[PDB]
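ingest -> validate -> predict -> emit
validate: passed (alphabet ok, no gaps, 121 aa)
predict: started
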Amino acid sequence: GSSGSSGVARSSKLLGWCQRQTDGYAGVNVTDLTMSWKSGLALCAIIHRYRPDLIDFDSLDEQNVEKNNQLAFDIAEKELGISPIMTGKEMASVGEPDKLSMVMYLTQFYEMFKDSGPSSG
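emit:
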């Protein structure tokens, strides 16, 4: 979309943020807010990005889909407090999440890392 395009769902405000934050990881390459996350790596790359202690991506394996999720869903609420909307197994089995639910949920993270302390990393 070149300068001029009117309001369009594509490239949602939330997405962008993740596209910039997740930037750097491997395999993540956030392309959508449904499947790209289903894997779990993405979500994990979010918590680690700021707090690598809480969640360890390096350890996590791109093979584990239910784990990557089950973990975040726990770690997040554990420290962050963002209650999980669905279990890892329910997110690893489902064919595809719900745009809305996904965005709404993800937001929680952003709203928390939207204006994080100025202390550069």
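The first helix runs from residue 13 to 21.
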